[PDB]
Design a binder for this molecule. Structure first.
Ligand SMILES: Nc1ccn([C@@H]2O[C@H](COP(=O)(O)OP(=O)(O)OP(=O)(O)O)[C@@H](O)[C@H]2O)c(=O)n1
Ligand SMILES: C[S@@+](CC[C@H](N)C(=O)[O-])C[C@H]1O[C@@H](n2cnc3c(N)ncnc32)[C@H](O)[C@@H]1O
Ligand code: SF4
Ligand SMILES: [Cl-]
Length: 280
């Protein structure tokens, strides 16, 4: 298993409360910058070409984040450095200062109907304003702009083509709501995503309406369950499909930890996990 593409969820804290979140604020723990850099070095030596920064909200700690993006690009010479964020805490000067080391910046927006963004819980109804401003900043300092969308029971009938034809992200991830055991599957967890779930037919309603876009990347449940390399806030590997957890790579190493998780490389390539992820 060559971990060519890794998501490092370095924090679990966030400033929003989307009802379907499958990566909840279980801990406020965060790794040290020496340990995180060592973990990113360990993954580089195992073959990782693309790092993606995620978790709760990465831009809750823009000093920690920016330190790691300059590290991954200047020191580890990673092919792709990417970030996924809800966009609200991004400051323009941070983008300007770190544009050279960022290949992709992804901002989440699940609807362009701000009432549904309130119903979802991603804020108080300004996500589209946040969204367009992030994309404006990306095109200024020449970062590839990417958009992530979660298709729920409240927005699968939504026609988004006017906005997609305007933003024109180079990459548009379209997730079906995923139920992850122990994260959002009941009322004993920090979120109850059961009200947002849709069927394979309801998902296809949204997909057929929008698949014509080149950026469009459809990610149904079967393509999301085990197609990812999930790195914990302790730098452990998460198997969210099987509800399992490894020891931190900092102690047992990359290759020994990877052997405990399931990673569907077949679904990884089906979802176009490998792509032209570099430049600026
Ligand atoms: N079972 C899953 C599946 C996905 N994710 C997370 O969902 C997030 C959104 O995915 P995306 O932004 O598409 O991840 P990238 O790795 O950046 O995808 P790509 O490289 O293809 O752009 C990722 O952080 C991933 O870790 C997760 O927590 N649990
Ligand atoms: C968990 S978030 C955290 C990163 C950042 N705060 C953001 O929203 O972009 C990462 C991505 O996963 C998506 N996501 C969260 N919960 C999900 C679920 N249950 N099913 C599918 N996607 C989900 C979010 O919309 C976001 O695009
Ligand atoms: S999804 Fe909504 S809640 Fe879960 S992390 Fe990203 S922003 Fe915070
Ligand atoms: Cl672009």
């Amino acid at each position: 298993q060559i971990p060519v593409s890794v998501n490092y969820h370095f924090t679990r804290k966030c400033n929003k409360s989307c009802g379907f979140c499958f990566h909840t604020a279980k801990t406020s723990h965060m790794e040290d910058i020496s340990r995180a850099k060592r973990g990113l070095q360990l993954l580089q030596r195992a073959g990782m070409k693309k790092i993606n920064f995620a978790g709760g909200e990465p831009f809750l700690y823009p000093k920690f984040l920016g330190e790691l993006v300059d590290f991954c690009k200047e020191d580890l010479h990673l092919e792709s450095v990417s970030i996924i964020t809800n966009g609200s805490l991004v400051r323009e000067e941070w983008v300007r200062k770190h544009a050279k080391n960022i290949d992709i910046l992804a901002c989440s927006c699940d609807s362009f109907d701000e009432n549904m963004n309130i119903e979802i819980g991603r804020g108080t109804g300004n996500q589209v304003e946040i969204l367009y401003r992030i994309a404006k900043w990306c095109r200024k300092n020449e970062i590839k702009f990417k958009l992530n969308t979660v298709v729920t029971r409240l927005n699968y009938e939504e026609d988004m083509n006017e906005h997609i034809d305007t933003l024109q992200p180079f990459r548009w991830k379209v997730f079906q709501v995923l139920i992850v055991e122990g994260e959002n599957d009941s009322e004993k967890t920090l979120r109850d995503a059961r009200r947002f779930t849709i069927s394979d037919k309801q998902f296809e309603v949204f997909c057929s309406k929008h698949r014509h876009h080149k950026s469009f990347v459809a990610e149904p449940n079967r393509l999301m369950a085990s197609s990812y390399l999930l790195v914990d806030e302790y730098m452990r590997f998460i198997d969210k499909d099987g509800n399992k957890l490894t020891k931190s790579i900092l102690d047992v190493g990359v290759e020994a930890a990877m052997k405990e998780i399931k990673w569907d490389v077949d679904a990884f390539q089906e979802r176009g996990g490998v792509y032209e992820w570099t430049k600026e």
